[PDB]
Amino acid sequence: VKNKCVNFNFNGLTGTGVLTKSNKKFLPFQQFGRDIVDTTDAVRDPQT
Amino acid sequence: TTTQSYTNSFTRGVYYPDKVFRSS
Ligand SMILES: *[C@@H]1O[C@H](CO)[C@@H](O)[C@H](O)[C@H]1NC(C)=O
């Protein structure tokens, strides 16, 4: 469920937040996302 | 056979250390 504050457990990466569609350019070998200060920002759906 | 001449690698041979996306 998107655009709704939910607890997520993507591939053992526990946390909480609001997730939605994005226009990142994840390379085929990429799995996670991060920012300048090293906080997980984007994740790739294991079944999608 | 083979030779063992020496050259300079320039700026070459950098891979992605991890699998984490980063921009700017
Ligand atoms: C996950 O598995 C199901 C059944 O095997 C398949 O229909 C679906 O396409 C798969 N999803 C991905 C992203 O591979």
Resolution in angstroms comes to: 3.5
Question: Considering Cα of A18, then A19, then A24, then A26, what sign does the dihedral take?
Answer: positive
Cβ-Cβ contacts under 8 Å, B20 against chain A: 30-34
**Atom 5 in ligand 1: residue holding the nearest Cα:** A47
Candidates A24, A30, A35; nearest CB to B19: A30
- Min distance A12 CA to chain B CA atoms (Å): 16
Per-residue DSSP letters for B1-24? ----------S-----SSSEE---
DSSP state of A36: T
Are the C-beta atoms of residues A10 and A41 closer than 8 Å to each other? no
Could you tell me if the CB of A16 is within 6 A of ligand 1? no
Method: cryo-EM
